[PDB]
Design a protein around this ligand. Structure first.
Ligand SMILES: CCCCCCCCCCCCCCCCCC(=O)OC[C@H](COP(=O)([O-])OCC(O)COP(=O)([O-])OC[C@@H](COC(=O)CCCCCCCCCCCCCCCCC)OC(=O)CCCCCCCCCCCCCCCCC)OC(=O)CCCCCCCCCCCCCCCCC
Ligand SMILES: CCCCCCCCCCCCCCCCCC(=O)OC[C@H](COP(=O)(O)OCCN)OC(=O)CCCCCCCCCCCCCCCCC
Ligand SMILES: NC(=O)C1=CN([C@@H]2O[C@H](COP(=O)(O)OP(=O)(O)OC[C@H]3O[C@@H](n4cnc5c(N)ncnc54)[C@H](OP(=O)(O)O)[C@@H]3O)[C@@H](O)[C@H]2O)C=CC1
Ligand code: SF4
Ligand code: SF4
Ligand code: SF4
Ligand SMILES: [Zn+2]
Lengths: 233, 140, 239, 114, 117, 350, 123, 181, 136, 123
C-alpha cells in the first residue's frame, strides 16, 4: 500500500525474497491453523508434529531478521537486510523433507472416518452466500469459486512462479481442510522455485530518500548521512 | 512437589501465547519438567498472563485469578503484560497486568522466546525452592 | 545410495553476476490503458444514474464514486445487480473524519466483483447527528462493518437491525477514531482492594505521551505530481 | 535481545546523544537527557529504556550513527520485580561492558549487511 | 560516609560507593546527580540491598583523558574510529579536525586528541 | 481529574522539619510526599490502611515476616510506592531499618492468642516498647499505636492487661504518640466475627452470648487512621473508635441468621469446660479460639468518658445491619402465575 | 443469515418529536421494569429504589434538549445501554460506573470555597 | 511427473544404516519417507556467525542507478512523478459531452469556444439536457461501446482459468477438491 | 537416539562419577570432548557421536548446584547457541575486544539483595533558592 | 449551533473549565521554509496542577492532563471556530502576523553617497 502511494518500485531480488518468505509464512500459518483445528476436534498429535516444522521455519525467520515472530523484515521499499550467506541451501534441505512431513499428517487425517464425521457437511456455505458475507480465501474457494489474488491481481513475484489453486465444491469444513492441505504443497512448490531463481542485486529500493543508505556510505558520504538522519527522525 | 508438578492456567491473550505453545512443542517439551497446562483455574497453581490485557478483559482476568486455589503464583510474560508494551498509550489497554493481580516473575521480550519463558519458569522455581513454610511457622 | 554419501550442496558452484541491470521505469506507466478503461466505465455509470452520481475519481486502478447519502441504496443495488457490474462481495465499510468539512464523516464502501475481477469504491457523507442508510438489506456481511463504523466514529446506519458497540469496552464513552478524541482517552482501570473490584478513574500517566510530530518538515516535500488523465477526458482547447 | 551501551576501545562512550534512537523508537521506550560534559564533549546525562514498553524491534540499533545502542543475544534476564526492568544509563553501560565480546562476534558477522 | 537525611537522621554509606565511578570521585556534568544525592533521595529502596552488586561502570572521561595525543604533519587530522580487524562499518562518521590553533583538538565523536607536528 | 482527598493543602511541614510538596492530581501516578511504615500491614486492618495510603502515592514501607502473605499489597500502588522489608521483633536492626526514613509510623501488631515464641507480653509490651524506642531514637514525626477496646492494666484478661501495659509503655517512651482503640471490627473476611458466625459448625458461649460492644466497620477504622495520619492536631490524643449502636452477641447471631436464611447453631457451655477445651486446642499449630478469648467473653465494651471519637475526625460510622448482607453474601442459602405461564413454553423437543 | 439479539431495536430516526416522546417513555418504562433484574445480575449493595432513582436522574439530564436529531441519538444510545444491561453483557465493574455516589467517602477534604481550592492548587 | 516421489537417500535427513536399514525398509508404510532429523555435519554449518562470505560482502547495486556519471536524480525521481487523482463532477462530464474532448474536439475556435466552456462551467447546460441533446454517434462512441453495449467493469490483468485433471491433479478423482491453474 | 545402547556406551566412555553427576544435573548421559572453561568455572563440551541430533552437539556442565543460564559467560553464551563455530578460547587476538577497564562477569541477581536498584541520574530540573535574610 | 458536546461522550469538564487556542503556526526563526504555517491549529491551554511533574522513581515527566498532546488541524479559521462551537469549547483566536512587504534591490548596495558615508558596507 505504501509503495503504491509512494510510486516506487521494489527491485527484483527484493520481490523474490518477499514471495519466498510469503510462502514460508503461508506454510507457518497453515501449520498453526490445521493443527489447531485438529487439536480442537481432539486429534492431539498433528499439533506436535507440525510445531517441529514451525520451529525449523522460525529459524529462517530469525536468521534473516533477528526475531522468531515479529520480524519487521518486509518494509515499504523492499526488505530491511539481505539474506545471509548459507540460507538458500538450508531452505532447500528443509524443503527436501517437508513433503514427507505433510504426508504423515495426511495419513492421520485425510481418510480417517472420525475426521470425516467431524468435518463433512459441517459449516456449509453456498457460493452466493459466501460472496454476500464477505468471505475470502479458503472460506470462498471451498464453495467452488476460483478466486485467488495471487492469480487474479499478481503482486511482487507471483507472476514469475508456477503454482496451482485448489477449489472445493461442497463448501464445508472437509473441503476447506483439503484446500489448506493442497496449499501446503503449492507453497512448497513456490519455495523451491524461489530457491532456484533467486537473482542478484539490491533488496530495497535504491533511492535514499525512501530507504536508508548502507552504513559505510552513512559514515563516509555527506548526502547519505543527511538522508539517514532525516529518515530516522 | 511444588516445583515438579507445575500446572499453569493459560491466559493466552495474544502473540505471546504462540511462544507459549512452542514451549510445549517437541523442541522444548515443557512436560518433561512436569508442566501441564490446565483449562480450569481450580486445577492450576500458576497463572501466566501472555498477551495484551485490555480494559474490557481486566475484570475477567481478576476473576480467573481469584478462583485459583492456594498457593498461587503469577508470571507476567511479554511487554504488553509487563507494562503495556507497544500499546502503552492506548485508550483501551491496561498498563501492566500488575495493576490487576500480584506478579511473582516478569519475563521480558516481545515476544519472549521459548527459552526466555523457560528461564522465567526456572526463576519461579528458584523462588519456590527457597520458600519457608514450616520453618516460617516455627519462627512465629 | 545412503544419506551418508548425500552430495554436499554447500560446495556446488554458485551463480556469479558481474553487474546487475535494472532499468529505470515509473511504476504508474503500467496503469495508463487501464486508467483509460476506468474513465470510460465511470462515464457510463454517471450517464446511467445522473440522479445519483455526484462524481467520480480515478487513481491508477482505483475508481471511486461520490454520492449523497440518500443515493446509497439505489446505486448500491445497481452495483450489486447490474449485469456489467456484478459487485457481489462487500469488502469493507469504514469512516474517515474530516473536521474541516461541514459534514465531518465520509463513509467509504469497497466492493469486489469476482465475476469481472474488478473493484470499486463508493463514498458518501454524514455528521454526528445525520444517519446513513444501512446496506445490510443488500449485503449481510455489511452488518459487522457498520457496527465497527458506529463504534469508532459515531456514524449511525438507518435500518441496521442490531447496532451496538463491537470493539470498545462495555459502557465506553466516546468514539476513539475521531480526530478530537485523545490518544490515551480519558479513563484508566485498576484493581481496588477497598471495593474488591476493577474501578475506573481519570487518566494519569507516569510518563506523559511525547508527540514528536512537531518536527515535521518546513519544506513542501513532493510537489504537484503529474496528471495521467487520458486525452478523451480533457476538455478541448479552442483552436 | 537485551539492550546495551557500547564503548570505544579507549573506554570513551560511543553515544554522543544525537537522540536518533529516541526519535525512531516505535514504543517511545527511550528517554534521553544531555548537555556539554566538563571536558566539552557532547554526552548523555540520562539514558533510560523502559524494557516493559520496548518491543525489541531493533530500530534504535539501526538508527544509531555510532553503534552505541545495541541489542545483545541475551534473553535470560527475567526479574522478580518490575522496578528492575527500568534500565538507567549505569545499567546499560554495565551491560555493554559485560557483553562486549559477544557483541563483537555479532558485529563481525553482520556489520557488512547493515 | 555519613549523609544527613531530610528526616534529620543519618545514612551511613561506605566511602567507595559514594564515588561517582570507580575511577572518579566527582560528577562530570552540571545536571548529573551525585551518588550522595541519589542515596539521600532514594534510600528507602536501597535498604537491605547489596551495593557491591549494583552497576558501577567506569567513567569514560578519565579513560579518554588517558589516551596519548596523536601528532600530525599538516593542518588537518582525519578520524573515523574504525575497527581495522572487523568487516563492515564499525567506527563513527569520518570527520576532519583542524589543528592549526595551539594545543590539542578533540574528535567530536570519540574524544581522540590530535595536534600539529 | 483525581484529588488528594486526604490532604488539606499541597505544601506540608512535618514536625521533624521536612518539607513535602504533593505532585500531580492525586491518582496512581501522583505522590503526596509522605513516607509511612505500617507494622502489621499484611493483616486484616493493615491491608485496608495500606490500600488507602498507596492510593494517593504516599510511600509505604511494609515490614513483613512471610513473603507470600504480603504479595497482594503490591497491587495497591504505582511502581516504587510499596516497599517491602524483612522484619522480626527480635531483630532490633530490622525495626530501625523499617522506621528510619518515615514521616509516619503506625503499629498494628497484635495477636489474639499466645504462641510458642510470643506470649501476650512479648507481642504487646516488649514489641510495642521496641518499636516505640526505634521511633523515639529516630525522632519520627507521627507515631500511631493501635490497642484494643477495654485495654486496662489490671484487667482479668491477659489480652486487655498487656494492651494497657503497651499503651503505658508507648506513652512513656514517645510522648507525642496517638493511641487508637477500635471496638470489634467486622468486614470482608474478618477475624473472630461475622465470617466465623457464617461458617462455624457451632458457636459456643460461656456467657449465654450476653457481652455487648459497639461493632465498627474495618473500612471506617482505616479511614479514621488515615485522617489521624495526616492531621497533626491528633498528636498525643486517645481515640475510641466504636460503632454507632450497641449490640449483644445473641443479637448479632440473630441478624446473621436472618440475612443468611440459615439458622446458626449456638451452644452454651460451662466456662470451666469450655476453657479446658480451648486450652487443649491451643496444642495444634493453627489459630483457634483462645482461653483468654473465653475470658473476654465475660467483658462488655467500656468506652472511656474522655476520649476523642469518630466525630473529631468528621467521620460517621456505617451501620452493621445495613452492611451485613453485602459482607456475608457468599454464604446465603439460596407459583399460581408461574404454572399458567409455564404451560405456553416448550419443555421437550425432538 | 445474521439475526438480531435479545432486546435489539432497528435504528429508526423519528421524524417527529411526539413519535420520539412515545418511544422515550417506553424506554423509561423498560428501565424501571428491569431494575430488579439489574439488582440481581450485578450483585449490588444498594436497593432497587436507588437503581430506579439513578435511572430517573439519567433521563432527567436530557429533559430540555430541543434539536430532534440530538434527541434521536440520545434515544438510540439509551436503548443500546438498556440492551447492554438487561442481557448481562456488562460485568459488575462497568455497571457500577453509573453509581459513583454509592461508594464511600473518598476523604476528609473536598474543597468548596476559593481558599480551600487554592490551598490544594485547584483554585 | 515432476513433484513425484524421490528416494530417501536424496533427502537431507539422518535415517538408518546397516541391518536396521533393512528392517526399516521391510517395516515402513512408505520406505521413501525421511525421518525429519537434519544431517548434523551439513545443516546450518558453518554457523551464521562464522560465514567467510561476510568478509567479502559489499552493498549490492544495479546499473544504471549506480552510475557515477550519467544519472541525475530528477530523471529517476519517481515519487515526485506521482499520478494526480482525477476528479470529475457532472459539470466536467457535461463539458465532455457537449464540447467533445482534447482527443476528438467538437468545439469552435475564438471567443465561441471560450464562451461555450464558460457557460457550461456556469450552469447553463445541465447534465441531463446534455445527455438528451447528445447524438447517436456521441452516445455510442463515448458513453456506450461502438456496438451500443455498456462497458464491462474493467480488469487490469485478465486471468484465464484452466482445470487440471488426471495424474497432474493434486487429489485423485474422488476427492471434492479440484486443481485450477 | 533414544536407545539404551547409546546411554550404556556414553556411561562407559565417561565413567561412573561423571555418569552420576550428569544424572543428577542434566538427566541424560552425554560423552564429548572438553572445549574450554568459563571465567565462572562452567565447562563446555562438543560431541561428534552420530547418534546426537542437530542442536544437541554442544552442552555445558555448570560449576554450581544452583545452576542458571545467566551464569554462562558472554562469548560462551553465543557459542553454546551455535552462533559461532570457534570457541572463545580459540578466537585469535585480532578478534577480541580491547578494554581499558577491568572485566567482571556478574550473573542475574534478581530475587536477591544484589538485584538492580534503578534511579534518576539527574538532579531536579528546577533548583530552589537558598533562603537568606538581610537587615533593613 | 448544534450542541454536539452532549453526543460525543467527552467529559463535561472539557466544555466547562478548559480553554482552547486557535492559531496559525508562526514562521520559525531558524528556517526559511514556511510549510507548516498555513494550517489552523487548535490546542488546549495547560492546567497548572495537572500539567507535568517529575516521577520520583526514574525521573520521567508525569501528567494528569489527557489533552496535553492533542492538536487539531483545520483548513480555515472559520472551520476551526465552527468545530469549537459545535463541541462547546471556549476558545481564543490568535490572529497571525505576516511580514510587511518592501521593495528590495541588489543595486541599492552600491548607491552613490553624496556626503559622509553612514557605514561601510562590506559584502
Ligand atoms: C484427621 C481428623 C480430622 C481432622 C479435622 C481437622 C479440622 O477440624 O479442621 C477444621 C477446619 C475448620 O474450618 P474453618 O475455616 O476454621 O471454619 C471454622 C470457622 O471459620 C470458625 O472456627 P470455629 O471457632 O467455629 O472453630 C471450629 C472448631 C470446632 O469447635 C467446636 O465446635 C467444639 C465446641 C465445643 C467445645 C467444648 C467441647 C468439650 C471439650 C472437652 C474439654 C477437652 O474447630 C476447631 O477449633 C479446630 C479443630 C480442632 C483441632 C485442635 C487440635 C488441638 C490438639 C492438637 O476445617 C477446614 O479447615 C475446612 C477444610 C474444608 C473441609 C472440606 C471437607 C469437609 C466435609 C468432610 C465430610 C467428611 C465426611 C466423611 C464421612
Ligand atoms: C513427619 C514429621 C512430623 C513431625 C513434625 C515435627 C513438628 C515439630 C514441632 C516442634 C514442637 C514445638 C511446639 O511446641 O509446637 C507446638 C505447636 C503449637 O505451637 P504454637 O505456634 O504456639 O501454636 C499456637 C496456636 N494455637 O503445636 C504443634 O506443633 C502441633 C503439631 C503436631 C504435629 C504432630 C505430627 C506427628
Ligand atoms: N479485629 C478486631 O476486632 C480488633 C483488632 N485489634 C488490634 O488491631 C490490630 C490489627 O488488627 P487485625 O488486622 O484484625 O489483626 P491481624 O491478626 O489480622 O494482623 C495483626 C498483624 O500483626 C502481626 N503480628 C502478630 N504478631 C506478630 C509478631 N510477633 N511479630 C510480628 N508481627 C506480628 C501480624 O503479622 P503476621 O501475619 O506475620 O503474623 C499481622 O500482620 C491488632 O493490634 C489488634 O490487637 C484491637 C481491637 C479490635
Ligand atoms: S508482548 Fe509482543 S508478542 Fe507478546 S502479546 Fe504483546 S505484542 Fe504480542
Ligand atoms: S528495540 Fe525498538 S522498541 Fe526497543 S528501545 Fe529499540 S527502537 Fe525502541
Ligand atoms: S545511542 Fe546512538 S542514536 Fe541513541 S542518542 Fe546515543 S548516539 Fe544517538
Ligand atoms: Zn574519532
Amino acid at each position: 500500500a505504501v509503495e503504491k502511494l509512494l510510486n516506487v518500485e521494489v527491485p527484483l531480488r527484493g520481490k523474490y525474497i518477499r514471495t519466498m518468505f510469503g510462502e514460508i509464512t503461508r506454510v507457518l500459518n497453515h501449520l498453526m491453523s490445521v493443527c489447531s483445528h485438529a487439536m480442537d476436534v481432539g486429534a492431539l498429535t498433528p499439533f506436535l508434529w507440525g510445531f517441529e516444522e514451525r520451529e525449523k521455519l522460525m529459524e529462517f525467520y530469525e536468521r534473516v531478521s533477528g526475531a522468531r515472530l515479529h520480524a519487521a523484515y518486509v518494509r515499504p521499499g523492499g526488505v530491511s537486510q539481505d539474506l545471509p550467506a548459507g540460507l538458500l541451501d538450508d531452505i532447500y534441505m528443509w524443503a527436501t523433507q517437508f513433503g514427507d512431513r505433510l504426508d504423515e499428517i495426511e495419513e492421520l487425517l485425510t481418510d480417517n472416518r472420525i475426521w470425516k464425521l467431524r468435518t463433512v457437511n459441517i459449516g456449509t456455505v453456498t457460493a452466493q452466500d459466501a460472496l454476500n458475507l464477505g468471505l475470502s480465501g479458503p472460506m470462498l474457494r471451498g464453495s467452488g469459486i476460483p478466486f485467488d489474488i495471487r492469480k487474479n491481481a499478481p503482486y511482487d513475484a507471483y507472476d514469475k512462479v508456477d503454482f496451482d489453486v485448489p477449489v472445493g465444491m461442497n463448501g464445508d469444513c472437509y473441503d476447506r481442510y483439503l484446500i489448506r492441505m493442497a496449499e501446503f504443497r503449492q507453497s512448497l512448490r513456490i519455495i523451491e522455485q524461489c530457491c532456484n531463481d533467486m537473482p542478484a542485486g539490491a533488496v530495497k529500493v535504491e533511492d535514499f530518500k525512501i530507504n536508508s543508505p548502507p552504513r559505510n556510505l552513512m559514515k563516509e558520504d555527506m548526502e547519505a548521512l543527511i538522508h539517514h538522519f532525516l529518515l530516522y527522525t | 512437589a511444588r516445583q515438579g508438578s507445575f500446572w499453569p492456567v493459560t491466559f493466552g491473550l495474544a502473540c505471546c501465547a504462540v511462544e507459549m505453545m512452542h514451549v510445549s512443542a517437541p523442541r522444548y517439551d515443557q512436560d518433561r519438567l512436569g508442566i501441564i497446562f490446565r483449562a480450569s483455574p481450580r486445577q492450576s497453581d500458576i497463572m501466566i498472563v501472555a498477551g495484551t490485557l485490555t480494559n474490557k478483559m481486566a475484570p475477567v482476568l481478576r476473576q480467573v485469578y481469584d478462583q485459583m486455589p492456594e498457593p498461587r503464583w503469577v508470571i507476567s510474560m511479554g511487554s504488553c503484560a509487563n507494562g503495556g508494551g507497544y500499546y502503552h498509550f492506548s485508550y483501551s489497554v491496561v498498563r501492566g497486568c500488575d495493576r490487576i493481580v500480584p506478579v511473582d516473575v516478569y519475563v521480558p521480550g516481545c515476544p519472549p522466546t521459548s527459552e526466555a519463558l523457560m528461564y522465567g519458569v526456572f526463576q519461579l522455581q528458584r523462588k519456590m525452592r527457597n520458600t519457608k513454610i514450616t520453618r516460617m511457622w516455627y519462627r512465629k | 545410495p545412503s544419506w551418508e554419501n548425500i552430495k554436499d550442496i554447500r560446495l556446488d558452484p554458485k551463480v556469479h553476476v558481474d553487474e546487475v541491470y535494472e532499468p529505470i521505469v515509473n511504476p504508474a506507466d503500467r496503469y495508463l490503458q487501464h486508467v483509460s478503461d476506468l474513465h470510460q466505465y465511470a462515464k457510463y455509470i454517471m450517464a446511467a444514474l445522473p440522479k445519483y452520481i455526484q462524481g467520480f475519481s480515478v487513481w491508477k486502478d482505483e475508481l471511486t464514486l461520490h454520492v449523497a447519502p440518500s443515493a446509497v441504496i439505489p446505486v448500491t443495488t445497481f452495483l450489486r445487480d447490474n449485469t456489467s457490474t456484478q459487485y457481489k462481495s462487500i469488502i469493507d465499510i469504514t469512516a474517515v473524519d474530516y473536521p474541516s468539512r461541514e459534514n465531518r464523516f465520509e463513509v467509504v464502501y469497497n466492493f469486489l466483483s469476482v465475476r469481472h475481477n474488478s473493484r470499486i469504491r463508493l463514498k458518501t457523507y454524514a455528521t454526528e447527528v445525520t444517519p446513513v442508510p444501512s446496506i445490510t438489506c443488500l449485503y449481510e456481511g455489511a452488518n459487522w462493518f457498520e457496527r465497527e463504523a458506529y463504534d469508532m466514529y459515531g456514524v449511525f446506519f438507518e435500518g441496521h437491525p442490531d447496532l451496538r458497540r463491537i470493539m470498545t469496552d462495555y459502557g465506553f464513552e466516546g468514539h476513539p477514531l475521531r480526530k478530537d478524541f485523545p490518544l490515551t482517552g480519558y479513563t484508566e482501570v485498576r484493581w481496588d482492594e477497598e471495593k474488591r473490584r476493577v474501578v475506573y478513574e481519570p487518566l494519569e500517566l507516569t510518563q506523559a505521551f511525547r508527540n514528536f510530530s512537531a518536527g515535521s518538515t518546513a519544506w513542501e516535500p513532493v510537489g504537484p505530481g503529474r496528471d495521467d488523465r487520458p486525452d478523451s477526458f480533457k476538455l478541448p482547447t479552442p483552436k | 535481545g537485551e539492550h546495551a551501551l557500547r564503548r570505544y576501545p579507549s573506554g570513551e562512550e560511543r553515544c554522543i546523544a544525537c537522540k536518533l534512537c529516541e526519535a525512531i523508537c516505535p514504543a517511545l521506550a527511550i528517554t534521553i537527557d544531555a548537555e556539554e560534559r566538563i571536558d566539552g564533549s557532547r554526552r548523555t546525562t540520562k539514558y533510560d529504556i523502559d524494557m516493559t514498553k520496548c518491543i525489541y524491534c531493533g530500530y534504535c540499533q539501526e538508527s544509531c550513527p555510532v553503534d552505541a545502542i545495541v541489542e545483545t543475544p541475551n534473553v535470560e534476564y527475567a526479574t522478580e520485580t518490575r522496578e528492575e526492568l527500568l534500565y538507567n544509563k549505569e545499567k546499560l553501560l554495565a551491560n555493554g561492558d559485560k557483553w562486549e565480546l559477544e557483541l563483537q562476534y555479532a558485529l563481525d558477522a553482520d556489520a557488512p549487511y547493515r | 560516609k555519613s549523609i544527613i537525611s531530610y528526616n534529620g537522621n543519618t545514612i551511613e554509606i561506605p566511602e567507595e560507593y559514594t564515588k561517582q565511578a570507580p575511577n572518579r570521585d566527582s560528577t562530570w556534568a552540571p545536571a548529573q546527580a551525585s551518588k550522595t544525592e541519589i542515596y539521600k533521595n532514594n534510600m528507602v529502596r536501597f535498604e537491605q540491598k547489596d551495593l557491591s552488586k549494583q552497576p558501577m561502570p567506569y567513567a569514560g572521561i578519565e579513560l579518554i583523558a588517558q589516551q596519548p595525543v596523536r601528532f600530525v604533519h599538516g593542518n588537518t587530522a582525519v578520524c573515523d574510529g574504525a575497527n581495522h580487524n572487523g568487516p563492515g562499518a564499525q567506527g563513527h562518521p569520518k570527520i576532519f579536525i583542524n589543528v592549526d590553533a595551539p594545543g590539542s583538538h578533540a574528535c567530536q565523536y570519540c574524544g581522540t586528541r590530535y595536534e600539529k607536528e | 481529574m483525581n484529588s488528594f482527598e486526604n490532604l488539606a493543602q499541597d505544601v506540608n511541614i512535618t514536625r521533624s522539619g521536612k518539607t513535602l510538596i504533593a505532585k500531580g492530581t492525586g491518582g496512581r501516578s501522583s505522590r503526596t510526599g509522605y513516607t509511612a511504615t505500617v507494622f502489621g500491614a499484611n493483616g486484616f486492618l493493615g491491608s485496608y490502611l495500606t490500600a488507602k495510603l498507596a492510593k494517593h502515592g504516599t510511600t509505604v514501607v511494609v515490614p513483613y515476616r512471610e513473603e507470600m502473605a504480603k504479595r497482594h499489597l503490591k497491587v495497591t500502588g504505582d511502581l516504587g510506592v510499596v516497599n517491602f522489608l524483612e522484619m522480626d521483633l527480635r531483630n532490633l536492626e530490622s525495626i530501625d531499618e523499617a522506621v528510619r526514613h518515615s514521616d509516619i509510623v503506625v503499629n498494628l501488631i497484635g495477636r489474639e492468642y499466645e504462641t510458642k515464641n510470643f506470649n501476650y507480653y512479648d507481642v504487646h509490651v516488649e514489641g510495642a516498647r521496641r518499636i516505640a524506642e526505634a521511633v523515639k531514637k529516630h525522632n519520627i514525626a507521627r507515631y500511631i499505636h493501635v490497642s484494643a477496646f477495654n485495654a486496662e492494666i489490671d484487667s482479668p484478661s491477659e489480652f486487655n492487661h498487656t494492651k494497657g501495659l503497651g499503651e503505658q509503655v508507648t506513652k512513656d517512651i514517645v510522648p507525642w504518640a496517638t493511641i487508637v482503640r477500635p471496638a470489634p471490627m467486622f468486614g470482608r473476611e474478618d477475624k473472630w466475627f461475622l465470617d466465623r458466625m457464617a461458617r462455624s459448625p457451632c458457636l459456643v458461649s460461656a456467657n449465654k452470648f450476653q457481652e455487648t460492644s459497639n461493632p465498627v466497620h474495618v473500612i471506617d477504622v482505616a479511614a479514621a487512621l488515615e485522617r489521624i495520619c495526616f492531621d497533626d492536631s491528633t498528636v498525643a490524643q486517645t481515640f475510641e473508635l466504636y460503632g454507632p449502636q450497641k449490640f449483644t452477641q445473641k443479637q448479632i447471631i440473630d441478624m446473621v441468621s436472618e440475612t443468611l436464611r440459615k439458622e446458626v447453631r449456638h451452644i452454651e457451655l460451662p466456662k470451666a469446660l469450655y476453657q479446658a477445651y480451648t486450652k487443649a486446642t491451643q496444642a495444634i499449630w493453627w489459630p483457634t479460639y483462645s482461653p483468654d478469648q473465653v475470658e473476654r467473653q465475660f467483658l462488655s465494651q467500656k468506652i472511656d468518658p474522655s476520649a476523642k471519637t469518630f466525630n473529631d475526625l468528621d467521620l460517621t460510622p456505617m451501620e452493621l445491619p445495613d452492611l451485613m448482607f453485602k459482607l456475608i453474601r457468599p454464604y446465603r442459602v439460596n407459583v399460581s402465575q408461574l404454572e399458567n405461564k409455564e404451560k405456553t413454553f416448550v419443555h421437550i423437543l425432538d | 443469515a445474521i439475526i438480531a439479539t435479545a432486546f435489539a431495536e432497528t435504528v429508526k430516526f423519528s421524524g417527529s418529536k411526539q413519535e420520539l416522546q412515545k418511544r422515550t417513555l417506553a424506554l423509561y418504562r423498560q428501565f424501571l421494569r428491569g431494575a430488579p433484574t439489574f439488582a440481581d445480575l450485578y450483585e449490588v449493595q444498594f436497593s432497587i429504589p436507588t437503581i430506579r432513582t439513578k435511572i430517573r436522574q439519567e433521563f432527567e439530564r436530557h429533559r430540555f434538549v430541543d434539536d430532534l436529531s440530538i434527541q434521536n441519538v440520545l434515544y438510540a444510545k439509551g436503548h443500546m445501554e438498556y440492551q447492554e444491561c438487561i442481557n448481562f453483557w456488562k460485568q459488575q465493574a462497568q455497571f457500577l460506573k453509573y453509581f459513583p455516589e454509592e461508594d464511600d467517602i473518598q476523604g476528609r477534604h473536598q474543597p468548596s470555597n476559593f481558599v480551600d481550592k487554592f490551598l490544594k492548587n485547584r483554585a | 511427473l515432476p513433484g513425484g516421489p524421490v528416494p530417501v537417500f536424496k533427502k537431507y535427513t539422518v535415517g538408518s544404516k546397516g541391518i536396521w536399514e533393512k528392517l526399516r525398509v521391510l517395516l515402513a508404510i512408505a520406505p521413501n519417507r525421511s525421518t525429519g532429523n537434519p544431517i548434523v555435519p551439513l545443516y546450518r554449518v558453518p554457523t551464521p556467525g562464522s560465514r567467510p562470505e561476510a568478509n567479502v560482502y559489499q552493498d549490492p547495486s544495479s546499473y544504471p542507478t549506480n552510475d557515477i556519471a550519467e544519472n541525475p536524480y530528477w530523471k529517476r525521481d519517481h515519487r515526485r512523478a506521482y499520478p494526480q487523482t482525477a476528479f470529475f463532477d457532472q459539470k466536467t462530464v457535461t463539458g465532455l459531452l457537449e464540447l467533445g474532448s482534447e482527443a476528438t474536439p467538437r468545439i469552435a475556435d475564438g471567443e465561441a469556444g471560450t464562451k461555450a466552456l464558460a457557460n457550461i462551467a456556469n450552469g447553463g447546460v445541465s447534465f441531463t439536457q446534455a445527455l438528451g441533446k447528445s447524438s447517436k454517434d456521441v452516445i455510442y462512441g463515448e458513453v456506450l461501446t461502438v456496438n451500443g453495449l455498456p462497458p464491462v467493469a474493467p480488469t487490469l490483468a485478465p486471468k484465464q482459468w484452466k482445470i487440471i485433471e488426471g495424474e497432474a491433479a493434486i487429489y485423485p478423482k474422488g476427492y471434492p477438491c479440484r486443481t485450477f491453474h | 537416539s533414544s536407545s539404551l545402547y547409546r546411554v550404556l556406551r556414553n556411561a562407559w566412555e565417561v565413567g561412573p562419577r561423571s555418569y552420576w553427576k550428569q544424572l543428577n544435573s542434566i538427566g541424560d548421559t552425554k560423552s564429548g570432548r572438553l572445549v574450554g572453561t568459563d571465567i565462572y568455572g562452567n565447562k563446555f563440551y562438543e560431541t561428534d557421536h552420530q547418534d546426537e541430533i542437530h542442536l544437541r552437539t554442544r552442552y555445558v556442565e555448570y560449576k554450581e548446584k544452583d545452576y542458571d543460564m545467566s551464569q554462562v559467560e558472554p562469548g560462551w553464551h553465543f557459542w553454546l547457541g551455535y552462533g559461532v563455530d570457534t570457541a572463545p578460547c580459540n578466537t585469535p587476538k585480532e578478534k577480541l575486544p580491547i578494554r581499558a577497564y577491568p572485566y567482571k562477569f556478574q550473573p542475574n541477581y534478581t530475587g536477591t539483595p544484589g538485584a538492580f536498584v534503578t534511579y534518576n541520574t539527574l538532579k531536579p530540573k528546577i533548583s530552589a533558592w537558598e533562603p537568606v535574610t538581610k537587615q533593613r | 449551533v448544534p450542541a454536539h458536546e452532549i453526543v460525543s461522550g467527552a467529559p463535561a469538564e472539557l466544555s466547562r473549565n478548559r480553554v482552547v487556542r486557535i492559531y496559525q503556526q508562526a514562521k520559525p526563526a531558524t528556517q526559511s521554509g514556511e510549510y507548516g504555517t498555513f494550517a489552523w491549529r487548535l490546542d488546549w491551554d495547560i492546567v497548572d496542577v495537572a500539567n507535568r511533574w517529575e516521577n520520583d522513581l526514574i525521573g520521567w515527566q508525569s501528567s494528569g492532563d489527557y489533552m496535553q498532546a492533542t492538536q487539531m488541524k483545520f483548513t480555515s479559521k472559520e472551520s476551526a471556530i465552527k468545530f469549537a462551537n459545535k463541541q462547546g469549547w471556549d476558545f481564543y483566536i490568535q490572529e497571525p502576523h505576516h511580514r510587511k512587504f518592501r521593495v528590495k534591490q541588489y543595486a541599492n548596495n552600491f548607491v552613490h553617497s553624496y556626503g559622509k558615508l553612514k557605514h561601510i558596507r562590506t559584502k
